[PDB]
């Protein structure tokens, strides 16, 4: 296995009935609940108890991130109680590990994580190429729902010495 | 480019039928197009077929078209192409190779030498 | 489908010189959308695999030395060394990656004078 997760999510709250369940099982009943984004804050510690589905972060590519010092999920143990949280703390891959990560709190709305501004690797912060672009993943439609009409193709990119194939999505 | 192994050189009977495997490394095939291109001995490139793994969807040659099927396997990672009722025309070295929106073939494998002899 | 001839078939430069080989294809492969030439070079060694040199008929691919240029546009293209070294030697294929099928040229054999 790689770049994959056991149980690392959950922690939702239901709170208002926006669709935030949209995605679990997402053949039907998905749609966004108002579209006409805004620039992410640097990237520190997560919150597990307030943070709802898996986090992707982006590398060059998407990449799962479990609990940090790791979680269990069996049943039938004696014990009690789960909140254990996850890492992120990361500078830009060639000097570090990854970008930045992103993310749907626990009310049903996305929480984006970023590095300090300073072509993609010299300045880019999230998932985002370009403003009229970003990495796609299985769950982008739910962390970016204005962006289903977005056109998806194949694109290949380096960061430092490593080929990296990716799919975006595009206005066009 | 990107790591992509193939099997080794099979030696097929004239009528069989033989798979052949393109297993990637480094990162996921979902992401790419895979083409599979055969080079006959002296003979130019030419292009078998390609597959899309991210949906199965696959694009063959009219040449190639009923004995070259392309599958691909998402969680092993691979890439498969079935040659079936092989002649002497068939003996050839296979290559696979991937490609983005361009469909320019940038990364390849080593090869595989299919010889159809009795 | 697009038929590719490459000129010429045998070809043999000494070390340093400046080559030129030319490949032709039936259709243009302009798109005028983007206004870029669907045609990639290939360079295959004795006893290799083919490696892409450079796509898009101008756009050289990543690691490839800057000696290789590849010039031309519309129906007729041209790939170039401006200065050929000894292990220059190889098989070069001209490809048309417009429309499907995707054919291959014959194939320039680089000889080396020594």
């Known amino acids: 296995g790689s770049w994959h997760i056991n149980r690392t999510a959950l922690n939702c709250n239901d709170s208002l009935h926006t669709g935030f369940i949209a995605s679990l099982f997402y053949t039907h009943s998905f749609n966004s609940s108002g579209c006409p984004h805004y620039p992410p804050r640097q990237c520190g510690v997560v919150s597990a108890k307030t943070v709802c589905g898996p986090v992707y972060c982006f590398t060059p590519s998407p990449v799962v991130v479990g609990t940090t010092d790791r979680l269990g999920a069996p049943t039938y143990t004696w014990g009690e109680n789960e909140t254990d949280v996850f890492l992120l703390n990361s500078t830009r891959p060639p000097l570090g590990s990854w970008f930045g990560c992103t993310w749907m709190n626990s009310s049903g709305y996305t929480k984006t994580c970023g590095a300090p501004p300073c072509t993609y690797l010299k300045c880019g912060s999230g998932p985002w190429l370009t403003p009229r672009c970003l990495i796609d993943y299985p769950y982008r439609l739910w962390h970016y729902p204005c962006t289903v009409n977005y056109t998806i193709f194949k694109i290949r990119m380096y960061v430092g010495g490593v080929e990296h194939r990716l799919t975006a999505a595009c206005n066009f | 480019e990107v790591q992509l192994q193939q099997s080794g050189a099979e030696l097929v009977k004239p009528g069989a039928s033989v798979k052949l495997s393109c297993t990637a490394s480094?990162?996921?095939?979902?992401?790419?197009?895979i083409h599979w291109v055969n080079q006959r001995p002296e003979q130019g490139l030419e292009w078998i077929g390609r597959?899309?793994?991210?949906?199965?969807?696959?694009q063959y040659d009219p040449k190639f078209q009923g004995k070259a099927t392309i599958t691909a396997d998402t969680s092993s990672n691979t890439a498969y192409l079935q040659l079936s009722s092989l002649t002497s025309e068939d003996t050839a070295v296979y290559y696979c190779?991937?490609?983005?929106?361009?469909?320019?073939?940038?990364?390849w494998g080593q090869g595989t030498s299919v010889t159809v002899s009795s | 489908d697009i038929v590719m001839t490459q000129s010429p078939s045998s070809l043999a430069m000494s070390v340093g010189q400046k080559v030129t080989m030319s490949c032709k294809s039936s259709?243009?492969?302009?798109?005028?959308?983007?206004?870029?030439?669907?045609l990639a070079w290939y360079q295959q060694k004795p006893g290799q695999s083919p490696k892409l040199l450079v796509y898009?008929?101008?756009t050289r691919e990543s690691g490839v030395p800057d000696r290789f240029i590849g010039s031309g546009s519309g129906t007729d293209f041209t790939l170039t060394i401006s200065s050929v070294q000894a292990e220059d030697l190889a098989d070069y294929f001209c490809?048309?990656?417009?429309?499907?099928?995707?054919?291959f040229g014959g194939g320039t054999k680089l000889e080396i004078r020594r």
């Open positions: 190779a991937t490609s983005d929106y361009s469909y320019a073939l940038d990364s």
């Open positions: 480094g990162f996921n095939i979902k992401d790419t197009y």
């Open positions: 597959i899309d793994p991210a949906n199965g969807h696959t």
């Open positions: 259709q243009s492969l302009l798109n005028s959308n983007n206004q870029k030439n669907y």
């Open positions: 898009f008929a101008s």
């Open positions: 490809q048309q990656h417009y429309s499907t099928p995707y054919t």
